[PDB]
A paper describes a structure:
Carbamoyltransferases (CTases) catalyze carbamoylation, an important modification for the bioactivity of many secondary metabolites with pharmaceutical applications. [name] and Asm21 contribute to O-carbamoylation at the C7 (S configuration) of geldanamycin and ansamitocins, respectively. CTases in class III, which modify secondary metabolites, adopt two nucleophilic half-reactions, the formation of carbamoyl-AMP derived from ATP, CP, and Mg2+ and the subsequent transfer of the carbamoyl group from carbamoyl-AMP to the secondary metabolites. [name] forms a face-to-face homodimer through unusual C-terminal domains, a previously unknown functional form for CTases.
Author numbering:
A (entry chain B): 1 to 680
B (entry chain A): 1 to 674
Write the structure that this text describes.
Amino acid sequence: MLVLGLNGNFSAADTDVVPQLGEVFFHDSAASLIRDGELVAAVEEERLNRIKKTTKFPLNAVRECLALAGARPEDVDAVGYYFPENHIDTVLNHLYTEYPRAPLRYSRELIRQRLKEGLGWDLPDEKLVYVPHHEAHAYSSYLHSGMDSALVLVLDGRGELHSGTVYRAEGTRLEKLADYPVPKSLGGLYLNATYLLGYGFGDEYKVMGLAPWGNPETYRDTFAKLYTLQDNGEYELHGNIMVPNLVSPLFYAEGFRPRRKGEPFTQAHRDFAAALQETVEKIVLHILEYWAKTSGHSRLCFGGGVAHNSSLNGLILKSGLFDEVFVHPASHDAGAGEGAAYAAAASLGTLERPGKRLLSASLGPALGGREQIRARLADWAPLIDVEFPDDAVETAAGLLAEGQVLGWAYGRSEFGPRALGHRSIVADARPEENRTRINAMVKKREGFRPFAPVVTAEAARDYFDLSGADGNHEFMSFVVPVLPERRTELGAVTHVDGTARVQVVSAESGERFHRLVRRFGELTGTPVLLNTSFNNNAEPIVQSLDDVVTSFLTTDLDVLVVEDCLVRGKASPDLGVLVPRFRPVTRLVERRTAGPDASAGAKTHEIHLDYDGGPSAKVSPELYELLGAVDGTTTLGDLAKTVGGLSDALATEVFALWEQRFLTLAPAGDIGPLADDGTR
Amino acid sequence: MLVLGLNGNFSAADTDVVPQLGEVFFHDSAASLIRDGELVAAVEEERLNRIKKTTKFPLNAVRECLALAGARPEDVDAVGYYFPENHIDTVLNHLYTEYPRAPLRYSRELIRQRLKEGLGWDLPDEKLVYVPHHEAHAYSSYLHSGMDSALVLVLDGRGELHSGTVYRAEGTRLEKLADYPVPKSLGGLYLNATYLLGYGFGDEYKVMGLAPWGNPETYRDTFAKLYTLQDNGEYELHGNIMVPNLVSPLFYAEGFRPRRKGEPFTQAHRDFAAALQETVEKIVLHILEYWAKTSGHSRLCFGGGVAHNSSLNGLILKSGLFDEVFVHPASHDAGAGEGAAYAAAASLGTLERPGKRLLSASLGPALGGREQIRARLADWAPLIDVEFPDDAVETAAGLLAEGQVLGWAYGRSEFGPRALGHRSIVADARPEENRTRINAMVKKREGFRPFAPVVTAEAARDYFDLSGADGNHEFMSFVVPVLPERRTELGAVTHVDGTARVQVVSAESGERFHRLVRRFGELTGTPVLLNTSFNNNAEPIVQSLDDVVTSFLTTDLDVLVVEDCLVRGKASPDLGVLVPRFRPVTRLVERRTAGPDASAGAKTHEIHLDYDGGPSAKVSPELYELLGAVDGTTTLGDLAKTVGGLSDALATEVFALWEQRFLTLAPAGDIGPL
Ligand SMILES: Nc1ncnc2c1ncn2[C@@H]1O[C@H](COP(=O)(O)OP(=O)(O)OP(=O)(O)O)[C@@H](O)[C@H]1O
Ligand SMILES: Nc1ncnc2c1ncn2[C@@H]1O[C@H](COP(=O)(O)OP(=O)(O)OP(=O)(O)O)[C@@H](O)[C@H]1O
Ligand SMILES: [Fe+3]
Ligand SMILES: [Fe+3]
């Protein structure tokens, strides 16, 4: 049984199913492949089209998954989609009523069209299975837990009919115990509140990082007007008829000022995040207290997008309601896509399940074989210097010991939002200074948020209070207290309230990364590193070798360790050898607005990315003329000759567009098809 | 005692409060001026910025109203705004959470900023009065009815708290009797369903025009699942949690396919419209049957946007529930703006009301005095020929009897969506072929669309069944049956179901238009004319003289009668003398997307109008370069010199953009102050 799991919307690479399709319309597109009950491959489309949390159809993800499994498309026994057919088709139909130019293509026809055109694959109708959304979440969360039975809680924005579902899991069977309707959504409540902080979809993790700086007392009584806890683990969220936001009218009535772009977080803002986080924690703990007692179960699996609230998970762990708690590395909708594969297998016959608890999220495409990596890094020679140490991990541990900040790229990319030693940025965890230092290097502005530590399994309890239940820490799912006598030692990874979102790495979960952190501890007496995702502010986690080198070159990292090669940026990198390529969403525009006295107004030039929420940037007339000639093969230096040569000013302008990923800049050609390293 | 009524959003001419602000966020912006209880001026901002049902702040409308009243901003005693302050501000606050770059400016500050920067008018806080939305509607509908007591029904999409309100009115006092919550909205229901026919906001009256072509039986049982009538005048609409549309999920599940743009209206689409119309009729008549007998009122005023459903109104008329029914010419939110003025007067003193029932909607700016109109028509000389007949009404009646289709522009423009003899297109009402052609060739719209007749008050009962209650027909508020023995005679203006949305014109409601219809009847035996609004498919009703001439020249009208001047298009009109001007929302774009092998794609050029729902059109590289040099003063002919002269191809390309109103093209100068 080889089963593909799908989630996301149905847009092509260069256009959306309707123009400017909202970023919340079936997001985090991904493809998963299960074989004989095991997750053999999984990657989010965002890693391949470079659009964070993309809604586009995960065609590249499917292609990559088939290649990792050594399968033709025609080898796939079934395809599961993470929503029931009537629901996704009703939402598409609604979009089609709003955009009457859009042809009436529903999900089944669109899935078949994408696979046929993108992969030559004629998908027979009987192989496509649509799945209840919280059922897909529950299979993913529970089947990877290693448990024989468990209480399973799914909380997200919404499935087809519910915002929350409670199951009993035993063997391979799910039994639904309860649900909560869409308007009680805790994901919706949290996203609603996130907007008041000048943030939006996908920034919830920043709001959760801000909450420890706030005093939850200030707005506790205000949030108390928006929910009521009830008997039998029930609750109500009190809506309004004013706007489609649960939170904004009451906070407006009380004088709250929603944060503007570029404005710093006031004390009101920090307090607001603290009270929002406390509110959700109290509601979820109210749910779980009731269902722990009523079901009598001692084990919990927690899935859905809300299960990426690691602060909440830490409190669930500390609550003593359960003996064990498991959280999947991709508990958002990409994991529901994975669960849809299992549900399709169950519906189309018999369900094989994983043999063991999941410990590694390293499931995407790799960087490539040793020989094509060396050759590709040679293509980059005019920008980088490369060394080949005999023991790269030893060298790297030493570099980190000296205080250098490292890019670290090895093997298959992480499924889910956390970097865990395959597409990571690692540094010494002790100096408090590394917080503002590394934010500046990657140009992120989350100095209020600490970094996450990775510690060896052997040393974990010497630094972190894992007490309460036995939770899984291979994926940073849980916030835990840092032992008080260790907080000063771990200055870069300890929050203001003494907690940390810890990864515990073991020889089983990540051999090479474990060896790195252990060796650093042997060298320093502290076997803890900070571990942040390898991406700047304008991209998801890097995927390919070119992605990795690009990100290294456009950030202020000291050195890059990639498949045992040490990469450093040349004193003066030659941008001119890079070949510019449009992304499918890249648009280059000359604009005239209306001027005074009804004249044609100012003539401006701009580059932007054509998707809901995509960035945009002004460009000079000269760079406009240069970029208009991009042909996908001619180098930047040769293109620049048409406008007088690649001056320092033009190169600087191009480099700033490169940092924001408006276009692709890389040496001519590519690394080639990823080698069969014989590890399957 | 002089009071301004305001409605709409707060956006400037060239940008919106937030980018691409939705077309439904406080639309149909307008301004009204009340003096001593009388409505002395009123105009919708759409007529002035040329954006249909615009949401932009009605600055031009306020300026035009003050000019018509002969008043200065300082003379205004109070300003009413047609929604409560907390509600509009909470909506703005919500928009600001979605657009973190927008500064936190709420309605009080925005209204004062617009009036200060736009009119030099420093409005004190104590003169600005915010009004309950359905109260504003009710004042407008009731105070203009001529009645001293009535039941008043307001039905729209929503006010701040309700989708429907029932009032008792006595003297100048309103007392609420009932209201209906927002989820029960009949305006929302109708708009939800309108989207399944490939239409959008503002297209509801086209759905209503489609419905008589359909069989209401086909989808009657489907619609029955979406509402329940309950005892004592109550009802329920049955919502869903799938999408924010009440209608589309159930019809999707039963296999209905929403109409695509540019595709025909099938019999299923017709049947859908028929069942939707029947549904709203059944619910409203249910409400009214209860509240008529419960309140004891023999007279009804009906307002809110749903009261522009002429078919519904005609059924209310025929129901026997009331002896008299009144409907205001602007029953949508522009009329709520007017009622907000009365409500503001009532809160700051006692309330003066109109002395009589409103008979004329001729309330906007006029076209100009005779001298400036003749002078402006001379500026258009390279494009038109002008005659000055001794008796233009006499001449126009003869032209109509000879088969000509006429533009008709006189005096002050109509408040509200209907043309009533001040900004009208008229033709012989007798030949069915006139409907076919004026739909296909003149208005350029769908073949199913009906045309409305105007008839003299003295002949009305010779042609139409007005029986039932006494309704007011001066504003085309009611669909009525055409008498069976007259249906063949009135071929262009009798709908497929034998009805007509009639205007009854009298010497008192419109002396000049009444004279035209009467004379046509004396020449032909039939005192009835086809009367459709004077606008092409890309614009609201024309306002100014330049608007009128532009529309005449870009639609296939035979002759224009404007303030007693007979205008015809020249054999070969010289477009080169016209001076192009950008509209405040006009944008010009050269664009590349990605191309094969991740190249930059080939260049394309577009003109577009930068507002939500604004059109766009491809342009040639040559015209892109030409339009980039527009300065607002240089003629098209001189501009074209930079691209080698106004060729025939360029002039034709420019003509098509003019027709779609992407830019303003008119002779140098303007008509001056009116
Ligand atoms: N750290 C967090 N704390 C609270 N809520 C979060 C957090 N992270 C994500 N969420 C919420 O989870 C929800 C998204 O979860 P999920 O990925 O399972 O998709 P979804 O709600 O089912 O969307 P769709 O309707 O398109 O399927 C959002 O509402 C989001 O605000
Ligand atoms: N012929 C019609 N039949 C039924 N409903 C109509 C018709 N014409 C307009 N409507 C409805 O009237 C409603 C609008 O009425 P109105 O102008 O009074 O504004 P509103 O609902 O108060 O606007 P807002 O969105 O700002 O609250 C819309 O829902 C519209 O669908
Ligand atoms: Fe989900
Ligand atoms: Fe209204």
